[PDB]
Amino acid sequence: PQDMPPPGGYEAVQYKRNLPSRGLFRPRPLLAGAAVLMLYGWYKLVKGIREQNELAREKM
Amino acid sequence: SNAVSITKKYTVQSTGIWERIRRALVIDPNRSNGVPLNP
Amino acid sequence: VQPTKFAVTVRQSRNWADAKQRVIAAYRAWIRAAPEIQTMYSIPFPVSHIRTRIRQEFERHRYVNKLNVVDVLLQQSNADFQETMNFWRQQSHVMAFFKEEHFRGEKRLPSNFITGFLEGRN
Amino acid sequence: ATPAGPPPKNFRLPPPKNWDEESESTIDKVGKYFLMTEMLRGMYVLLEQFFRPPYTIYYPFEKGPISPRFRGEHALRRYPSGEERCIACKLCEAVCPAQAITIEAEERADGSRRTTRYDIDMTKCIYCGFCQESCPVDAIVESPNAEYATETREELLYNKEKLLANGDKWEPELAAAIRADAPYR
Amino acid sequence: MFGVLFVGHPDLRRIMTDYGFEGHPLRKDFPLTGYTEIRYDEEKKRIVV
Amino acid sequence: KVEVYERIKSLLAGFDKVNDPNNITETAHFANDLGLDSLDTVEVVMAIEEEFSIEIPDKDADQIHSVDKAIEYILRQPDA
Amino acid sequence: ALPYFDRLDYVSMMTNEQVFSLAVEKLLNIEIPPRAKFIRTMFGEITRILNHLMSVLSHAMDVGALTPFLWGFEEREKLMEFYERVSGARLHAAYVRPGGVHQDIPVGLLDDIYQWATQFGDRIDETEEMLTDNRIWINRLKGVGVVSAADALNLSFTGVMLRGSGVPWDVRKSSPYDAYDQVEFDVPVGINGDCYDRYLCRMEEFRQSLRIIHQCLNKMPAGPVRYEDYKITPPPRAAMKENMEALIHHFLLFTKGYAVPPGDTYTAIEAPKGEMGVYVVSDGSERPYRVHIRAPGFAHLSGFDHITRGHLLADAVAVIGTMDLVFGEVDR
Amino acid sequence: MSYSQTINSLVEVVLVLVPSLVGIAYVTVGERKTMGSMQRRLGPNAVGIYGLLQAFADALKLLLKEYVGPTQANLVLFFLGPVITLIFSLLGYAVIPYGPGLAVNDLSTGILYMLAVSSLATYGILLAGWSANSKYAFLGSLRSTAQLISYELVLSSSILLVIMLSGSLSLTVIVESQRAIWYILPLLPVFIIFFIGSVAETNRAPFDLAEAESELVSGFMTEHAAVIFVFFFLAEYGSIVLMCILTSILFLGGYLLINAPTVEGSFYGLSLGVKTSILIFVFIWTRASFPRIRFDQLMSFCWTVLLPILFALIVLVPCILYSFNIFPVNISLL
Amino acid sequence: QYALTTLDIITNWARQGSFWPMTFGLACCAVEMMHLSTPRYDQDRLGIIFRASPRQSDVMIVAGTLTNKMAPALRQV
Ligand SMILES: *P(=O)(O)OCC(C)(C)[C@H](O)C(=O)NCCC(=O)NCCSC(=O)CCCCCCCCCCCCC
Ligand code: SF4
Ligand code: SF4
C-alpha cells in the first residue's frame, strides 16, 4: 500500500501557546524574599559593627 | 490547559528519582526535551 | 537630486533647441568632472587624455538627427555620470573604458587586409 | 484593506486604556520592573537546557542520516556480467539542466552501441538526479558518497574512466539504494 | 533588462546588472552568455573585462 | 581689466584647436573669427573657469561666445 | 527550469517550486491528483516553518540573542531529514513539479512527521520564553520600522509586512490553491505595523503551520502523486521498461519535454516571505517564452528608504531582519 | 625575616600572576562549553583532551599570524593602546587578598588603586580607535569609551556604599568585616547594580556593542588582528575575572568560608575561587540569555535608572548607620 | 632536523586547532555552511569559529554564486 494515516487518525498535538505562570517569578514573593534578606542582614550588621566597635575599644 | 501530557510526546523520558527531580524543578513538566526515541 | 546625489528625472526634450542645451550641459558636466575622475579612481592618465575620450564619446553620436534617440542617449549619459561621480563604479569599470589597457592592445582590429590575413582574421 | 461588505464584527479596536485604568497592581508592576522577572524566567530556561542531552554527533566517527534517494557522487554501472549498462541514448545529456554531461559514441568493435566519451563536469552539476531519472537502463546514478573534496578543480572533471571506476567501487550501495526506491520510481 | 525608458521616473538606473554593463540581457537578440567576462590579472593587480 | 586678458592668451594660444595663433583680439569670437565648433567652445569656457577658479553656470556659459564676453563675465564674478 | 526555482528563496525551496508548478499546471489545463495536493500543502507548511526558523531566529541573532538560533536549527535539521527522505537533497529537492510531485513519500514518513509534531509546540514555546516578554527584545522591536496599512499596500508589501499593519489578507485564504481550502487555520494580523507586531505574527504562524500539518497527516488520501497522463508526467520506470507507449513518452519528456498550450498567466501563492508570483508566457512549444518571478523580498527592500528615513541608524538591523530578505529572491 | 626579600617577592608575584593567567585561559574555554551546554551542543572538546588546550591553540595561532597595521600612521602609537589596556587590566590583581593580607600589595588605599588602574585602561580602547585611522571604527570606540566611563561611575558609587559599612579601603578589612555578615544581604540592591555595572564595564553582553558585527555601526573590537587581538582579548577576560573577584570581595565575603598553614591558605583560596567561578558562570549565563541593548538605551539605563538609585542610597545608608550607632571605626582593626 | 619538525608540529597544531573562517555566504551554500555551527555538528567543538572580518580570519569559504558585480568585493577581502 501507500503511506497512510492510522485508521483512527493521529491524535491531536499541542500547538497553542503554553507559557504558564510560575510562583518562582511572581514579584510579590520575590519582593518579600528580598526584604527578609535585607532585614536579616541589617540585624546581623548592627550586631557585627557594635561588636567590632567594642574590639577597637579593647585594642586602644 | 494548553499543554499536552509529556507521556504522549515521542521523546526520551526521565525515570525514577530523576523524573521526580525534573517535575519538581522545571518550569513546565509537560515540556519535552526534543530528543527522539530510537525504537 | 532628491532620490540620490546625481539623480535626474527622466524627461523628453521639447524640441531640438531643448535637446542641444542638454547635450552641451551633459558634455560640460563630463569634462568638468575629469580632474575629479582621475584622482577618484587613480587613473594612470592625464586629464587631457580623459577629456579627449569624453569628446569622442559625444562625437560617435554627433550625426544623430532623431529626437527620441537623443533622449535615450541623454538618459544613458546621466546614468553613467551618476554612477561615476558617486563612487559606485570601481577602478576596473572605469579602466575598462580606456581601450589602451587591454593586454592585446587598442588596435584590436587589423590595419588592412594583408596584416589580418597573415595573422588569421586579426 | 478590509474585504468588501460590512466591516468584520469587532474589527474596530476599543479605545486605548489610560494608565489609571490598567488592571494590574502597582506592587506587581514595580516588582517586575526592579526584579526583572521575565529576564529571570528566561535565564531559568537555559539551565533547563543545560541539563538536557546535547544534539551533537561526533563526525566523522558518527554520521547523520541519509536516504536511498540521496543524490551524491555520480557513477556508471554494469550488468551482473560486467557489460556496461550505458548504450549512448543521450537522454541524460539532453535532460541535464546545467549541460554538465558530454557524450560521444559509435559502434564498438563488436558492433554494440556504446560510448567513447562520457564526461561529467562536477563543477557544472547541480546534483538534481534528472539523468538518473531519465536513464532507461539504470546506467547513470548518483552514489550516496559526499566526501570527495579535491585539491584541484581539474580533479572534478570526470571522464568515463573515473565514472566506471566509481560504479565498480560503489556497486553494492548502488544496488541497495536502487533496491529500496525502485518501487517508487 | 529591456532598455525601456519611463518618463517621470526619479532615479532610473540599473538595478541588476554590473556598473558599466553594456546591453539589455532580456532582449531576445542579447545572447545567453553575453559579450564579455572578467578575471583577475596578475600584472594589473586588479580585475579586467 | 587688463590682467584677465593676459591670462586669456595663456590658454587660447595653448589651445590646439585654434585655426591660427595671434588671431585673438579684444572682441574676437570663437566661432566666426577663431574657427571653433560647438564643443571646442564648451572646452574653452571650462579652461577659463579653471584659471579664475570660479564655476560658470550653464546658462552663463551659453551667453559666453566671445573673448570680450568672457572678460566682462569674469569681472562681474567676485571670485578670481 | 524547475530546479531554478529552488535557488530563488533558498530556505523556502518547495513553495518556490510550488508557485512555478501551479502556473504551469494552469496553462497545461490539468487538475493534479488529490494526494499530490495534500503532499504539497503538507510540505508547504513544513517549508514555512523551515523559513520562519531561519528568518525569526537569525533576526534574533542579529540583535544579540545567540541561543534560540541554536535551539531552532536542530528543528531545521529534523525537518531537512523529511526533505532528504522524499527527494535526495537537504535543500534543493526539485520535488514539486507540474503534475504533482516527483515520487511518492516512503511508507514510514507520515508517522515520523507525526512524532516530530508531538514535540514541536514545546520548541515554539521555549523560543517565546526568551523573546516575547523580554524587555530588551521589546525595546529593540516596539515602534521600530512602522509602516501604515495604506502605505504598505502602495509600497507593494505582502505577507507579514502587510498583515503587521492590520490588513487581514492571506493568499491561501483569498485565492486558495492545493489543499488549503480543505484545512483549517487562522491568520495572525498585527495592529501597530512595527517589528514587534511582525515578530508576533510570525511566532503565531509557527503554530498555525503545525496545525495545518497535523490536518494534512490525517486527511492524506490514497492514490497517485503525479497527474495520470504520460504526455505530461513521466511514466513509472516499470511501465517505461514494459510497454511501447510508456517508453516513447519517457523518451520524449526527457529530450523534447511536454508542450504547453500558448498563453500567459500570473500565478501567486502565499510564500513564507509573502506573495510570491510568477508570470509565464507560453508560445506553444516545450520551452517557456518568458518567465518573470515576482519576489516579495524585492518589493520589501524597495521600501527600506520609506520605512527608515528620519529614524535611527541603530534601528536599521531591526527592519532588515523584519523583512524576510534572501537575496536570491531579490536579484534572481 | 628568614630568607631574601627579593626571593619572597619573586615567588609571591609568580604565585598570583601565573595561576591567574591559567584561570583566564580556562574562563574562555568554560565560556564556550557553558554556552554550548545551554545551546544543546558540546563546545570545545577536540583541541587537547576534553578541549582543555583550546585557548592555547587560539593564542599561538594569533601570535604567529601576520599583523596588518594602519597606513603607517605610527608604529609606537598603534601598539601603545593595546599595551596600556593589557598592562592595567592585569595590574589590579596585585591587591587581591587570597586570605588575610595574602596579597602582592596589602594596600590601605587598595580600593582606590583598583579604581585608578581601571580608569587608565579605558585609554587603550580610545587610543586604538583613533589610531586605526577609520572614522567608522573611531565612533564605535568612542561609544565604547562613553559606556566604560559612565558605568565606572556606577561601580565607584556602589563601592562607596561598601566603604561606608567597613570604614576602610583595605580589601582585607572589607573581607574581615563580612565575618559579621556578607554585604550582599544588607546591600542587596547595591550588589545587583554593581554586578550589572561590572558587565557593562567589561563590554560584555547584553552591553557588547564593541564586538557586535551584526549591528551595522558596531564592532570596533572586530577589526583587531593577530597580536592586537590577543592584547585586547586577554585584557577583557582578565577584567572579567577581576570584576568577579572584586564582586566576591565586596559582597560575598571574599575568601571567607561558608590548623596547618598550607590547608588554611588552600581553603581561603578555594573559597574565593568558588565564589569567583560562580559569578563567572553567571557572567557567561547572561551573555547566552539576553539580546543586545542599543547604545542610546544603555546610556539611559545608566544615567536615569542606576545612578539615581545609587545617589538615593548614598543618602539613606549613612543615615541608617548614624541612627543605629553603627558608624564603624576607621583605625587599623581586622 | 628533529627540533624543526617539532616546531613544525607545534605551529601546525595551532593552525588546525583554531580554524577561523571568514564565511563569504553569497547564497544557498551559506545555509549548509550555517548548519555547521548548529548543535548537530557544532564546529566549535573542533575549534572552528566564524569571523566577520577578513582581518581576524585564516580561511575564506566562498559559499555561493560569484557574480561579476560582486567579484571586486571578493578580491578586496
Ligand atoms: P558641435 O556643433 O561640435 O556639436 C553639438 C552637437 C553634439 C549637439 C551636435 O552638433 C549634434 O547636432 N548632435 C546631434 C545630437 C546629439 O548631440 N546627440 C546626443 C549625444 S549625448 C552623448 O553622446 C552622451 C555620451 C556621454 C559619454 C561620456 C563619457 C563616457 C563615460 C565614461 C567617462 C570616463 C570614465 C570615467
Ligand atoms: S547514462 Fe543512461 S541515459 Fe545517459 S547515455 Fe548512458 S544509457 Fe543513455
Ligand atoms: S545531477 Fe542533474 S545537473 Fe548533475 S549531471 Fe545529472 S542531470 Fe546534470
Side-chain angles (χ1 to χ4, degrees), chain A, chain B, chain C residues 2-122, chain D, chain E, chain F, chain G, chain H residues 1-257 259-334, chain I:
Chain A
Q2 286 177 293
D3 202 14
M4 283 294 276
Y10 290 112
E11 317 242 358
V13 314
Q14 175 188 312
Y15 63 94
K16 305 196 170 79
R17 292 176 96 254
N18 189 57
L19 298 96
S21 188
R22 282 306 294 298
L24 195 51
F25 320 107
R26 280 130 210 204
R28 211 171 297 184
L30 274 186
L31 268 179
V36 166
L37 298 167
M38 298 205 237
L39 203 293
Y40 178 73
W42 280 94
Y43 173 68
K44 287 285 253 172
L45 185 71
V46 167
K47 183 169 88 22
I49 286 164
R50 273 181 193 171
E51 190 143 320
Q52 160 186 41
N53 271 344
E54 286 320 281
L55 291 175
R57 192 187 306 277
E58 161 180 57
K59 174 186 193 175
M60 278 306 96
Chain B
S1 182
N2 321 334
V4 169
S5 150
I6 190 57
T7 251
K8 319 159 182 299
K9 290 180 157 178
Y10 300 97
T11 54
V12 190
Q13 318 272 309
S14 282
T15 54
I17 189 42
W18 306 109
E19 173 67 17
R20 319 161 38 51
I21 278 176
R22 192 194 64 82
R23 302 203 94 105
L25 294 193
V26 308
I27 275 159
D28 169 47
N30 277 6
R31 266 189 201 153
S32 59
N33 61 16
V35 185
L37 304 159
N38 290 327
Chain C
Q2 197 186 118
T4 173
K5 214 69 60 169
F6 297 81
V8 191
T9 297
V10 189
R11 61 148 175 110
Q12 307 188 263
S13 282
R14 283 140 332 184
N15 46 70
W16 264 115
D18 181 15
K20 183 199 243 253
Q21 195 294 111
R22 304 173 66 170
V23 174
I24 307 271
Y27 186 54
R28 171 143 46 243
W30 268 121
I31 50 88
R32 168 187 289 129
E36 214 176 71
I37 283 161
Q38 190 194 358
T39 164
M40 167 189 201
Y41 296 90
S42 75
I43 303 303
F45 275 89
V47 173
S48 99
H49 205 301
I50 300 174
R51 267 204 199 104
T52 275
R53 288 290 276 111
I54 314 300
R55 164 169 257 253
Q56 306 171 339
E57 253 298 329
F58 269 85
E59 277 214 286
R60 182 178 340 161
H61 316 137
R62 141 194 303 290
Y63 297 103
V64 180
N65 51 17
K66 313 185 157 69
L67 220 33
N68 38 2
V69 180
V70 156
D71 302 339
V72 165
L73 294 159
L74 281 167
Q75 220 288 314
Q76 306 204 346
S77 173
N78 294 329
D80 313 336
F81 192 65
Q82 162 171 239
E83 88 161 41
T84 312
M85 311 314 325
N86 294 304
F87 193 69
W88 299 350
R89 281 219 176 78
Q90 286 247 22
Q91 201 209 41
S92 291
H93 302 110
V94 308
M95 268 329 288
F97 183 84
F98 286 93
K99 293 322 187 315
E100 305 93 356
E101 280 231 330
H102 186 305
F103 86 85
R104 282 205 175 272
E106 189 192 348
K107 302 303 177 301
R108 300 226 296 257
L109 297 155
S111 147
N112 40 277
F113 164 86
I114 204 64
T115 73
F117 175 92
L118 286 176
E119 55 210 1
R121 226 192 47 248
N122 191 38
Chain D
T2 54
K9 224 164 61 56
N10 320 138
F11 176 86
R12 186 183 286 277
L13 282 319
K17 266 180 182 356
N18 203 2
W19 73 269
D20 286 278
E21 306 152 23
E22 299 270 56
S23 41
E24 222 286 328
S25 92
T26 302
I27 294 105
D28 295 12
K29 199 156 151 54
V30 176
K32 292 164 222 123
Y33 176 89
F34 276 117
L35 298 171
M36 297 177 279
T37 72
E38 88 291 11
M39 316 219 313
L40 288 185
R41 189 174 159 125
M43 302 181 58
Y44 199 81
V45 162
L46 254 60
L47 262 46
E48 221 286 290
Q49 300 268 46
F50 178 93
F51 294 106
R52 273 171 182 189
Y55 290 117
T56 313
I57 72 171
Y58 296 52
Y59 172 88
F61 306 93
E62 311 151 351
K63 309 276 275 225
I66 75 180
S67 77
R69 303 184 187 186
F70 176 80
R71 277 140 44 199
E73 190 188 32
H74 289 79
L76 278 174
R77 294 181 62 233
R78 293 171 200 266
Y79 284 113
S81 84
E83 177 59 83
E84 280 165 53
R85 275 182 180 263
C86 187
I87 41 88
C89 72
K90 299 165 153 138
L91 267 51
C92 56
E93 191 182 43
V95 80
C96 185
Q99 307 230 319
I101 308 171
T102 317
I103 305 163
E104 293 173 60
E106 73 242 47
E107 325 179 77
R108 205 168 54 187
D110 66 342
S112 170
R113 189 185 168 123
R114 301 298 159 177
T115 51
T116 301
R117 158 205 308 288
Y118 194 107
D119 321 311
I120 302 175
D121 189 337
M122 309 300 272
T123 80
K124 283 191 196 64
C125 174
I126 64 146
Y127 303 83
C128 59
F130 291 14
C131 31
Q132 144 184 274
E133 301 167 46
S134 58
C135 196
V137 291
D138 301 23
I140 192 61
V141 307
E142 284 198 61
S143 76
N145 186 29
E147 285 120 346
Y148 57 109
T150 67
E151 184 217 76
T152 58
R153 186 137 101 72
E154 292 95 343
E155 295 163 66
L156 299 160
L157 300 173
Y158 286 9
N159 68 13
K160 194 182 161 176
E161 318 292 334
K162 176 69 163 126
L163 279 148
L164 262 180
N166 269 354
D168 296 344
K169 148 159 163 189
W170 289 99
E171 175 50 37
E173 298 232 18
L174 304 181
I178 283 149
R179 173 225 268 144
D181 203 48
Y184 303 90
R185 298 176 178 183
Chain E
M1 305 317 297
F2 296 89
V4 167
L5 280 199
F6 296 83
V7 67
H9 197 287
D11 200 22
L12 193 72
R13 35 182 192 114
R14 72 177 82 262
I15 181 135
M16 301 274 90
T17 62
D18 203 3
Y19 313 101
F21 177 91
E22 281 341 295
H24 301 293
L26 276 184
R27 274 173 191 194
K28 292 279 160 172
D29 63 284
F30 189 98
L32 179 55
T33 324
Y35 310 114
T36 58
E37 56 167 345
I38 79 171
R39 66 181 182 86
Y40 183 73
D41 179 63
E42 191 32 17
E43 232 173 17
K44 309 254 203 33
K45 297 290 185 325
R46 66 142 188 286
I47 288 175
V48 298
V49 192
Chain F
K1 266 198 264 180
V2 62
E3 39 168 43
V4 317
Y5 190 118
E6 72 204 354
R7 296 237 281 280
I8 292 285
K9 319 191 315 308
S10 319
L11 55 109
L12 273 92
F15 206 51
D16 210 8
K17 310 292 294 186
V18 293
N19 48 6
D20 197 306
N22 205 32
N23 217 326
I24 322 174
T25 89
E26 223 78 9
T27 44
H29 289 47
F30 309 131
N32 305 68
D33 314 281
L34 244 179
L36 297 186
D37 50 341
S38 75
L39 309 176
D40 275 345
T41 305
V42 178
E43 298 158 35
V44 305
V45 184
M46 182 66 48
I48 306 171
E49 140 174 349
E50 299 169 21
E51 275 269 348
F52 297 90
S53 301
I54 173 68
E55 188 173 358
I56 307 181
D58 294 356
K59 179 178 300 298
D60 294 14
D62 298 348
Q63 308 304 127
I64 302 170
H65 58 82
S66 53
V67 173
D68 60 292
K69 257 300 298 178
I71 286 169
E72 171 249 16
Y73 173 82
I74 52 208
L75 294 182
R76 300 181 292 179
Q77 257 57 37
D79 301 349
Chain G
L2 188 277
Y4 272 130
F5 285 79
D6 289 328
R7 305 153 166 87
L8 301 170
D9 170 357
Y10 48 66
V11 296
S12 283
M13 300 71 40
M14 283 192 194
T15 66
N16 296 342
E17 76 202 13
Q18 167 146 73
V19 74
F20 183 63
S21 305
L22 283 162
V24 173
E25 280 139 14
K26 202 194 193 19
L27 307 151
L28 284 170
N29 203 38
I30 52 143
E31 205 80 59
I32 59 171
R35 179 162 178 108
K37 274 163 156 63
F38 272 101
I39 280 157
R40 282 156 53 133
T41 296
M42 191 179 67
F43 266 101
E45 292 315 291
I46 282 158
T47 298
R48 186 178 315 280
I49 289 170
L50 276 168
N51 171 84
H52 284 6
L53 283 169
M54 165 77 59
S55 64
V56 172
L57 296 184
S58 99
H59 170 47
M61 182 188 24
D62 291 336
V63 295
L66 278 56
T67 307
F69 176 93
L70 280 307
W71 297 341
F73 265 61
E74 180 62 21
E75 286 308 281
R76 284 189 46 84
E77 290 281 348
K78 293 182 195 144
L79 289 176
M80 282 164 62
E81 190 281 303
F82 301 149
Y83 253 62
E84 203 279 330
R85 217 189 301 180
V86 299
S87 60
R90 279 168 52 87
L91 216 66
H92 301 327
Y95 186 62
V96 185
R97 311 181 184 184
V101 300
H102 179 215
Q103 43 190 338
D104 202 357
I105 62 183
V107 288
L109 177 73
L110 285 182
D111 295 299
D112 274 334
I113 296 180
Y114 169 66
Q115 285 176 65
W116 163 91
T118 75
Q119 60 88 51
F120 185 56
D122 296 324
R123 311 283 73 77
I124 302 168
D125 289 323
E126 301 196 318
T127 314
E128 285 231 281
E129 288 274 30
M130 323 288 321
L131 300 175
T132 297
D133 294 327
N134 186 275
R135 85 194 45 186
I136 303 175
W137 181 250
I138 298 170
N139 290 320
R140 286 295 301 264
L141 291 205
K142 217 168 210 299
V144 173
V146 181
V147 50
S148 76
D151 277 359
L153 286 168
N154 199 253
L155 282 156
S156 306
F157 292 4
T158 64
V160 168
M161 290 297 329
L162 182 63
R163 278 180 308 259
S165 306
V167 181
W169 177 264
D170 199 286
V171 176
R172 285 167 306 163
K173 295 288 191 181
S174 301
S175 51
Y177 59 90
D178 292 285
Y180 284 105
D181 82 289
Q182 283 169 93
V183 298
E184 273 138 15
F185 61 107
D186 301 308
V187 179
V189 182
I191 44 145
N192 302 319
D194 68 346
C195 290
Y196 192 56
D197 284 355
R198 284 185 299 266
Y199 155 82
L200 298 158
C201 290
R202 277 172 177 124
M203 287 324 261
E204 185 49 55
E205 266 179 29
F206 271 130
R207 325 189 161 276
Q208 302 304 304
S209 281
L210 176 71
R211 178 185 180 202
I212 292 157
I213 299 172
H214 173 262
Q215 288 161 88
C216 290
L217 293 169
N218 284 334
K219 259 162 158 283
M220 185 78 42
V225 303
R226 327 150 172 109
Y227 185 73
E228 289 174 307
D229 168 29
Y230 301 149
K231 310 192 179 285
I232 302 141
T233 54
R237 299 184 59 87
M240 171 267 288
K241 297 182 189 169
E242 192 270 329
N243 62 95
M244 194 68 228
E245 281 78 350
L247 178 64
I248 291 166
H249 283 56
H250 174 94
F251 190 104
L252 287 178
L253 283 168
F254 284 102
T255 63
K256 305 190 185 277
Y258 47 84
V260 179
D264 60 329
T265 182
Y266 180 77
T267 294
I269 62 134
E270 184 76 49
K273 303 186 183 243
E275 195 191 293
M276 209 181 142
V278 81
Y279 179 68
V280 187
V281 180
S282 174
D283 65 357
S285 95
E286 310 96 316
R287 293 185 169 175
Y289 190 78
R290 173 86 171 100
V291 177
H292 172 77
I293 294 140
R294 198 269 185 204
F298 189 72
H300 296 154
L301 187 63
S302 70
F304 187 83
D305 188 45
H306 169 99
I307 329 288
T308 64
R309 73 214 175 195
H311 302 298
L312 291 169
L313 176 60
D315 282 353
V317 180
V319 355
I320 283 143
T322 212
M323 299 162 180
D324 203 336
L325 279 188
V326 162
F327 282 88
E329 228 191 66
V330 173
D331 310 317
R332 289 157 272 126
Chain H
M1 284 336 149
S2 298
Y3 56 98
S4 150
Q5 190 154 265
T6 278
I7 306 331
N8 189 41
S9 306
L10 264 276
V11 171
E12 292 229 281
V13 155
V14 159
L15 279 159
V16 155
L17 190 52
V18 154
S20 277
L21 300 146
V22 167
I24 289 158
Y26 283 106
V27 145
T28 76
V29 165
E31 180 177 279
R32 292 166 67 177
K33 302 195 67 57
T34 308
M35 278 198 276
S37 299
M38 268 152 191
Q39 289 165 354
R40 303 291 300 276
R41 56 185 190 80
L42 309 184
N45 82 320
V47 175
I49 290 311
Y50 289 134
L52 288 187
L53 293 181
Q54 183 59 79
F56 310 120
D58 291 312
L60 206 30
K61 191 278 307 294
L62 279 158
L63 278 187
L64 299 180
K65 202 55 152 48
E66 146 198 313
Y67 61 101
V68 277
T71 56
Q72 209 56 52
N74 220 357
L75 194 73
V76 162
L77 292 197
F78 177 63
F79 295 151
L80 179 55
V83 168
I84 285 161
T85 308
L86 169 68
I87 273 163
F88 287 100
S89 293
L90 273 162
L91 268 177
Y93 287 87
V95 291
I96 299 303
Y98 298 86
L102 282 188
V104 162
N105 192 13
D106 177 38
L107 201 54
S108 63
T109 186
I111 278 299
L112 271 190
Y113 169 88
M114 300 209 78
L115 284 160
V117 300
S118 49
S119 306
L120 264 62
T122 321
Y123 270 92
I125 268 53
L126 187 59
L127 182 52
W130 183 69
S131 147
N133 288 11
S134 165
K135 205 189 81 64
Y136 156 76
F138 170 69
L139 277 201
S141 86
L142 190 59
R143 284 193 290 281
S144 167
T145 304
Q147 143 179 341
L148 260 47
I149 65 175
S150 304
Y151 281 94
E152 195 77 313
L153 203 79
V154 169
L155 295 191
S156 50
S157 276
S158 296
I159 271 151
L160 185 70
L161 287 164
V162 172
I163 311 305
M164 288 160 170
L165 295 205
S166 56
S168 174
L169 313 157
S170 168
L171 273 85
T172 283
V173 176
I174 296 160
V175 179
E176 302 288 320
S177 306
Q178 296 175 80
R179 296 185 188 270
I181 192 57
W182 294 3
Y183 286 160
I184 190 190
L185 293 202
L187 293 190
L188 176 67
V190 188
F191 163 76
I192 297 167
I193 300 186
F194 187 86
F195 183 81
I196 289 160
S198 77
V199 168
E201 192 57 43
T202 54
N203 292 108
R204 282 289 289 194
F207 304 98
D208 52 294
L209 281 179
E211 50 103 6
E213 63 278 0
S214 34
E215 326 277 328
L216 269 195
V217 75
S218 288
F220 155 66
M221 285 265 287
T222 60
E223 305 172 14
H224 285 139
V227 73
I228 290 330
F229 182 101
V230 167
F231 273 74
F232 285 110
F233 177 100
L234 191 52
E236 208 279 295
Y237 283 89
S239 314
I240 287 169
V241 165
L242 205 49
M243 286 278 84
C244 292
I245 295 179
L246 186 66
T247 307
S248 308
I249 288 299
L250 305 162
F251 297 98
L252 307 179
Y255 46 73
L256 293 184
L257 310 191
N259 69 114
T262 306
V263 293
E264 173 162 8
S266 68
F267 286 11
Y268 277 150
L270 289 166
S271 177
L272 176 64
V274 167
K275 291 172 210 182
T276 296
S277 287
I278 284 173
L279 295 180
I280 291 163
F281 176 90
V282 169
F283 224 93
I284 300 157
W285 188 12
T286 79
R287 170 180 195 180
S289 318
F290 302 133
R292 186 176 299 123
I293 304 142
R294 289 188 338 245
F295 175 71
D296 57 295
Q297 320 177 303
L298 69 81
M299 296 306 258
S300 179
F301 180 56
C302 174
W303 292 101
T304 82
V305 176
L306 292 184
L307 289 165
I309 294 179
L310 282 159
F311 287 39
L313 292 159
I314 286 165
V315 173
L316 175 55
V317 163
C319 296
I320 293 165
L321 299 174
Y322 176 73
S323 291
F324 281 87
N325 211 30
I326 57 159
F327 273 148
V329 294
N330 305 109
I331 64 183
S332 247
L333 190 92
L334 306 173
Chain I
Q1 288 217 339
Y2 177 87
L4 293 196
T5 88
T6 325
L7 295 294
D8 218 337
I9 301 138
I10 277 143
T11 188
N12 280 326
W13 166 87
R15 294 174 176 196
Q16 299 164 71
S18 36
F19 178 116
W20 290 359
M22 200 255 311
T23 59
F24 211 73
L26 293 168
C28 22
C29 282
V31 167
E32 286 268 59
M33 191 180 56
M34 160 177 343
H35 269 261
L36 271 203
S37 74
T38 61
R40 177 161 294 177
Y41 298 111
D42 189 26
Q43 56 188 38
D44 169 61
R45 95 164 166 97
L46 286 152
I48 286 93
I49 298 163
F50 283 151
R51 286 314 165 138
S53 56
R55 301 300 188 183
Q56 314 207 315
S57 283
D58 326 311
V59 190
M60 179 166 306
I61 298 174
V62 190
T65 325
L66 180 69
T67 63
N68 302 319
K69 186 170 209 176
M70 179 72 144
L74 164 86
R75 183 73 218 191
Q76 217 160 75
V77 317

